[PDB]
Amino acid sequence: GHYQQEAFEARKRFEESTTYPGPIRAATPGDTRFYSGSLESILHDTDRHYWRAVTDDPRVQHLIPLRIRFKIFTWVTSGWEQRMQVVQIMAPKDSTIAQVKDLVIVENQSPYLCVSSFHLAIDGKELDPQKTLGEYGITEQSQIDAIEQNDHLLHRDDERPRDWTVDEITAEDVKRSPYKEMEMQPLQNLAPRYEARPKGYFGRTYYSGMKQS
Amino acid sequence: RWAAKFYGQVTFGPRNYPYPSSRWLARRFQMKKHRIIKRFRFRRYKLAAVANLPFAKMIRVGMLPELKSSKTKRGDVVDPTLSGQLVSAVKNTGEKRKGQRTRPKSKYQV
Amino acid sequence: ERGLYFPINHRIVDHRIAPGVTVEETDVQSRYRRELRTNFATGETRQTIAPPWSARERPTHFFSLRLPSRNSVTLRVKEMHNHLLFSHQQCAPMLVSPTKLHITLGVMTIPENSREELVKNIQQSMSETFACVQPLQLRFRGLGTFDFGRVLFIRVVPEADFGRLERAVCDIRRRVGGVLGVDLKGNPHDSYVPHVTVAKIRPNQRQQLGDTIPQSLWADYQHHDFGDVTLSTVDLCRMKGSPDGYYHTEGAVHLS
Amino acid sequence: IAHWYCGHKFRHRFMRDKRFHPSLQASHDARNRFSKRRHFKTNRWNYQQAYRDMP
Amino acid sequence: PWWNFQTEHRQRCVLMYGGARTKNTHNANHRVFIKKYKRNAFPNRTRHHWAVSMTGVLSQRPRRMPWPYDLTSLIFNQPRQGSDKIGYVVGTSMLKTAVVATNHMVYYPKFNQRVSRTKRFFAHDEDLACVEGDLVHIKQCRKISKYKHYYVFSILEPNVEGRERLKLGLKAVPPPLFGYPVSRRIVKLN
Amino acid sequence: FRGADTYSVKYCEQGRYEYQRYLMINRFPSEYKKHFLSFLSNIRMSSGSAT
Amino acid sequence: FDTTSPAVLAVKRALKCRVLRNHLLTNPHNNIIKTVLANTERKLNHALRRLRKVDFKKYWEIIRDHDVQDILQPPNLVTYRQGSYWKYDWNAGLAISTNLADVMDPRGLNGCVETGRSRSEVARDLGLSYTRPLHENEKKQLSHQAVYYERLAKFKMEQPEAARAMERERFVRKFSGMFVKMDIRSGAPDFPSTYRRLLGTKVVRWASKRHGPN
RNA sequence: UAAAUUAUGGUCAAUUGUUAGUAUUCAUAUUAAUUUUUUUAAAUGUUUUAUCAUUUUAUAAAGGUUUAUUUUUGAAAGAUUUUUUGUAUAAAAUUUUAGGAAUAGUUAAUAAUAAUUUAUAAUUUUGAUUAGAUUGUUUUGUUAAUGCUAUUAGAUGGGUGUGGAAAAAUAAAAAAAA
Ligand SMILES: [Mg+2]
Ligand SMILES: [Mg+2]
Ligand SMILES: [Mg+2]
Ligand SMILES: [Mg+2]
Ligand SMILES: [Mg+2]
Ligand SMILES: [Mg+2]
Ligand SMILES: [Mg+2]
Ligand SMILES: [Mg+2]
Ligand SMILES: [Mg+2]
């Protein structure tokens, strides 16, 4: 918005200064890992956990915290839900989109995400695995999605996983994949016990951007 | 020393009484001490304190089944190895070996 | 079951993500302790940073403490090379030859026109600054990184005569950059971090070598002790690698 | 002095109060105030060669 | 009304004019100790309970109360009590962890005098400067691990002897000759 | 007697707020940031149309 | 004419001590001199511990000449753990006596009052490293830890199935187990400590209420 | 190392046993209590709603805890036409038994690792852990008084985890959307 161009322009004018001595690092503190409160809070790199009244010199950001979005199928008791999971890397400024794929693959801790090949895309347009973040104007604020192989098949009943509510789960597939891990047959402590949202939660029509009634 | 010098408070006289004990009181307590000691001798008491064991808790060897004086009372339960070793100690304490230092002997020590 | 239910190291809030996002819309997942991993662990070091205009131009000459012959340092660095090359021989182009080992006290850009005025004037000011300073016994242990893990060096511990160095340097810093305006890559009111550069990745090299020296090489030598050295000799050097087989030396001062 | 605390005599109360007295407290000099005698002569026969890494 | 005699009482529901509205808790109850165990067998190794045990904390005679005024508050202005502590480093066996012994103060109002007690803390030194026997400044902070709420703020006095001792490859300090006391007699010869 | 005649006269000779002494209250750096922020966003607006 | 100064005192007491020692070696029981040897040894201990805070190299060479390191050894673990061994040079008044500037450049020994950052932080910022010489323990621990991410990157690049297995177990674990969400009860850093009242009856995991300092 | 006055100021400390040679807080006293008396409590059916459902209605059962109990606003208050922020879970002090010994899903680093990661780990004689007794840091009684002597009650793990917060299975005396 306004911030982005205000600070961009500020940086760009700062770089064209003929006369500047350079900052004194005794006057330019780092950040503290030690502050009150139990939680450990990660902030912007321009920001500190103490009060600093003075505005520090604009720096180019050498580690850009990209966010890459995935679609997961979350099991809730009623049936499957399709929701969103972000993976966040720190990708070096000049890095190549291939390398961004690689960093993204290493950083995900969920078993259900990276199984097949995925393509990075912005507003539905694929990115060249060949070229730099610089060219595509990728910043933290930029919205990056990720698209799997079978994702364009999800409108069918096949690729989309089958919920034991409406579908047979057989000794074929009891031993394979999220079904196996889930332990469909109830145990005393109830197995891994997944989040549940009921059937009448959204009414007769499911969740939408547009009000349908 | 291990044992008790006195039994009960042997110096009880009024303050500034210019001796540790009076004759009267010391005679009373000498009586009580006498009775206790005589009891120790005739019942043939034996105590032991073993290394690498709690010391304040002393195995009473005079109650051990082998060395027990009474024919009736149930004596005590002490480890078989340890009790053998205690029996051997008590036994080989008795007599003077030459070159060893002379140590006081009595009837009631056996 | 073998520890805290929620391990304390895992409790992390990201404030660089908008409020309300993590509660409803989506959850954000990241390995957050790569970033939180500190300046001691990574081995980074914060050097005096250049203003952009100075950052544009290559440095030409530098101040150096010359290491004498028969050093503890040179010997142990040779031992370290042996070990590193036996582990991974991909290091071979990164490593600096033991012949070029020197302590870097500061870096500077001299333009080629004013060259002689500047070298004479510098040399003189340098000789005046170091007039009173007797030789310096400094201690070297530990490794560190400049320029995002591209430069791998031996730290100079502030346990010894180092204190004196700091005043000494900060004087030439206030003469060479303060008095006659010269481009010291930093502020003259700021002190430079002295170091012995061991491995380095130049721009041309970077393609075949990679963008950062993998920490797996020097991890074990990170805190290794290279020993003590007494130093009588200060040089102002231009960087030419073929003139004498040692950095081409434009000026010299003896500490005695 | 309430008679239920500590022993049936009075002086037992003041004998446990000496355990809390300010100027009587345990430190680097006065140690093991409560059982001195269980720890007495404990190391006599324990032979420990003292620690010297310097000549 | 607590200032009125036993016989002077009329209404028990209110204070007529002013003063303190006081509930009488009955202090003299003749409470007693029940003896449930033989003097021979008491079911504890270290201590035995034969009488009525005094209870509470600060209700405990003779009263021992927190004393804010000591060396530490003398030097520091603390936002919260115990936010600053000065102490000595005792041992470093744990990476990035310095154990610190510190003194604080207790006041006995009965005898009108103070005692110093001592307490150990785990402090977090990133970068591992602290050598055993350093005099350090220590602050309260973010919860770091199960037991570490404190970090090393500044080294007041480093240990120069200890550091040079380390540089030579020797331990910072000689290991204590005897450990904790025992109730046994260890006969170990040659 | 708790009445007005029990206290001295000098309580009514006093100017206002003169019983106060300078209070140095420090607090953690973190807490300064929190507090300054709070006061800032309160000065902007405390309540929605109610300000 | 110096007598009372620490170095002198330490030396003369060192000598007296050796003499008395070899004397006791010859004729076994005179307990008068056992006692005088012990007192001398104590006053020697005082003299040496004052020396190392006055000038430490002389302290060193005295210990190396006369071989007394045995009276500098802290007596027992108990009083040492409470830091009353280090507490001596507080009482002697030598605790602040160092005069740093010749050693240990003071710039990175102090923390920032307004910033709140520790001394390791301002040392980080000035690009200085104070670190004690490390033994092989700390070196091999650190050098083992430094490399975690390279090992991990190699693992999840080259061997995705094994990884996905482990992840299955973790992810599913998060739903099983004792507490699924973090609340004051769950997020209690010391569980057995803050709830001691559960320890015998309800909660059987822990047999004691205290595993650490507090 | 000198006195002082423009004179009682800045608002009350005040102790009561008839014993039995003498030494030592110890029977019979007053005050406060239990002995001792039905002038302050109380009965069951909570309530709306769109109908087999969904909205409102969050700390008195017991167990015995002494290094111990700690927290937000997203509910309501609450006011605008819609995206609204940041601050919290952490600690420090005070902790009992006449005669006193070892404790343990265990410390610290790594990390959303490890039922076999790495390490010379952690608690204890400055009194631990088990075990007894016990409801913790404005409440009483006596007294001229540093003391001695009381103070209830209320937070007892998890297992489809709802909810802003578990405080959620009789036991009000809290008006609960005309
Ligand atoms: Mg006789
Ligand atoms: Mg003879
Ligand atoms: Mg805790
Ligand atoms: Mg229990
Ligand atoms: Mg209850
Ligand atoms: Mg208990
Ligand atoms: Mg506490
Ligand atoms: Mg706490
Ligand atoms: Mg249950």
From TrEMBL, chain B:
**Residues annotated as region Disordered?**
88-110
Bias type Basic residues, positions? 98-110
Q: Which domain of life is it from?
A: Eukaryota
Kindly provide the name given to this protein in its UniProt entry.
Uncharacterized protein
> Which lineage is the organism of this entry classified under, starting from the top rank?
Eukaryota, Discoba, Euglenozoa, Kinetoplastea, Metakinetoplastina
Automatic annotation (TrEMBL), chain C:
GO MF assignments: protein kinase A regulatory subunit binding
Pfam family, any one: AKAP7_NLS
Gene3D superfamilies, alphabetically?
A: Cyclic phosphodiesterase
One term under GO cellular component: cytoplasm
Signal sequence bounds = none
* Residues in A-kinase anchor protein 7-like phosphoesterase domain copies: 59-255
Which superkingdom, per the lineage?
A: Eukaryota
Question: What protein name applies here?
Answer: A-kinase anchor protein 7-like phosphoesterase domain-containing protein
Automatic annotation (TrEMBL), chain E:
Source organism? Trypanosoma brucei brucei (strain 927/4 GUTat10.1)
* Coiled-coil residues: none
Domain of life here? Eukaryota
Specify the taxonomic lineage: Eukaryota, Discoba, Euglenozoa, Kinetoplastea, Metakinetoplastina
**Single annotated GO MF:** structural constituent of ribosome
Residues noted as binding Mg(2+) in the record, renumbered to the chain: 30
Keywords assigned by UniProt, alphabetized:
Metal-binding, Ribonucleoprotein, Ribosomal protein
> Its GO CC terms?
cytoplasm; mitochondrial small ribosomal subunit; mitochondrion; organellar small ribosomal subunit; ribosome
| GO BP field | translation
First and last residues shown, out of full length: 10 to 199 of 307
State the family named in the UniProt similarity comment for this chain. Answer: Belongs to the universal ribosomal protein uS17 family.
Q: What is this protein called?
A: 30S Ribosomal protein S17, putative
From TrEMBL, chain F:
Q: Which domain of life is it from?
A: Eukaryota
Q: What is this protein called?
A: Uncharacterized protein
